[PDB]
Scaffold this active site. Structure first.
Site, PDB file in Angstrom:
ATOM      1  N   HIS A  40       0.818  -1.218   0.000  1.00 39.98           N
ATOM      2  CA  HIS A  40       0.000   0.000   0.000  1.00 39.98           C
ATOM      3  C   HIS A  40       0.846   1.260   0.000  1.00 39.98           C
ATOM      4  O   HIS A  40       0.341   2.370  -0.183  1.00 39.98           O
ATOM      5  CB  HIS A  40      -1.019  -0.048   1.113  1.00 39.98           C
ATOM      6  N   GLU A  52      19.727   5.756   8.963  1.00 41.98           N
ATOM      7  CA  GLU A  52      19.117   6.927   9.588  1.00 41.98           C
ATOM      8  C   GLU A  52      18.818   6.794  11.066  1.00 41.98           C
ATOM      9  O   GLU A  52      18.351   5.772  11.557  1.00 41.98           O
ATOM     10  CB  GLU A  52      17.791   7.274   8.883  1.00 41.98           C
ATOM     11  N   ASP A  84      -0.467  -7.558   1.870  1.00 41.86           N
ATOM     12  CA  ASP A  84       0.077  -6.183   1.846  1.00 41.86           C
ATOM     13  C   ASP A  84       1.591  -6.231   2.025  1.00 41.86           C
ATOM     14  O   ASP A  84       2.133  -6.023   3.120  1.00 41.86           O
ATOM     15  CB  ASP A  84      -0.544  -5.383   3.000  1.00 41.86           C
ATOM     16  N   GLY A 175       2.499   6.585   8.531  1.00 41.11           N
ATOM     17  CA  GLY A 175       3.921   6.921   8.458  1.00 41.11           C
ATOM     18  C   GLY A 175       4.802   5.772   8.941  1.00 41.11           C
ATOM     19  O   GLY A 175       5.941   5.710   8.490  1.00 41.11           O
ATOM     20  N   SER A 177       3.807   2.747   8.307  1.00 39.88           N
ATOM     21  CA  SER A 177       3.506   1.635   7.376  1.00 39.88           C
ATOM     22  C   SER A 177       4.787   1.204   6.654  1.00 39.88           C
ATOM     23  O   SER A 177       5.571   2.029   6.228  1.00 39.88           O
ATOM     24  CB  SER A 177       2.545   2.086   6.273  1.00 39.88           C
ATOM     25  N   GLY A 178       4.849  -0.114   6.469  1.00 40.82           N
ATOM     26  CA  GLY A 178       5.937  -0.677   5.662  1.00 40.82           C
ATOM     27  C   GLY A 178       7.022  -1.188   6.599  1.00 40.82           C
ATOM     28  O   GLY A 178       7.859  -1.978   6.195  1.00 40.82           O
TER      29      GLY A 178
HETATM   30 CA   LIG Z   1      20.005  11.665   9.358  1.00 41.59          CA
END
Ligand SMILES: [Ca+2]
Length: 223
Positions: A40, A52, A84, A175, A177-178
């Protein structure tokens, strides 16, 4: 993530951010060339940001690599959200290190009660809307099939599990999701759907990764 805490810097080295101008979904590194995420979340240009912690500031452990192929599961259903799941091949291999690592696929499905860790940069609030720069974490348990199916009558398929808390206040949100649900060192869930976030008696529902090892292995081999 609602009701979570700020993860230690780089302590979730498999977590990725998918970006196209800004962060829109998470994902998990499962080998040096391939990310798993939610169907999705599909868009047709994605950049993958590995290593990150603070998405708003370049900190110098990051690697930014564009997606070369995006492969959504052929039976994904946008009405029920069954299957999904989506694979992304990077246009060049991630370099693996302290701040950048793969997560194992499941050797079996997980028992009810198993504690897992869920992570992401999605919305942090029940009322309203604040998106963090720093990666959030949440520990929560795999709920039984009965507590999942009583929460969502007729809507839980065999490729879905519920993870979280029936009293509300702790869950994944838009946000996230995944993103990864990791239990005893294995990726068992992808953030998929819910009714709102952190509502009483509506825990988050997650793609059940253990049904998908053969599809993932085969897709990698062929592409
Ligand atoms: Ca960074």
């Amino acid at each position: 993530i609602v009701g979570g805490y700020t993860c230690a810097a780089n302590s979730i080295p498999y977590q990725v951010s998918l970006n196209s101008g800004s962060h829109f979904c998470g994902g998990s590194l499962i080998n040096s060339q391939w990310v798993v995420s939610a169907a999705h979340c599909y868009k047709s240009r994605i950049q993958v940001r590995l290593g990150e912690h603070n998405i708003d500031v370049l900190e110098g452990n990051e690697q930014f690599i564009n997606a070369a192929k995006i492969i959504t599961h052929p039976n994904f259903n946008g009405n029920t959200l069954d299957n999904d799941i989506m694979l992304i091949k990077l246009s060049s291999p991630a370099t693996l290190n302290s701040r950048v690592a793969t997560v194992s696929l499941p050797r079996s499905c997980a028992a009810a009660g198993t504690e897992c860790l869920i992570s992401g940069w999605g919305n942090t609030k029940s009322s309203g809307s604040s998106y963090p720069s720093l990666l959030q974490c949440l520990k929560a348990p795999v709920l039984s099939n009965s507590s999942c199916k009583s929460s969502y009558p007729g809507q839980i398929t065999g490729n879905m599990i519920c993870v979280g808390f029936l009293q509300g206040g702790k869950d994944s949100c838009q946000g996230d999701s995944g993103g990864p649900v990791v239990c005893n060192g294995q990726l068992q869930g992808i953030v998929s759907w819910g009714y709102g976030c952190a509502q009483k008696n509506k825990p988050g529902v997650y793609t059940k990764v253990c049904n998908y090892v053969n599809w993932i292995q085969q897709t990698i081999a062929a592409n």
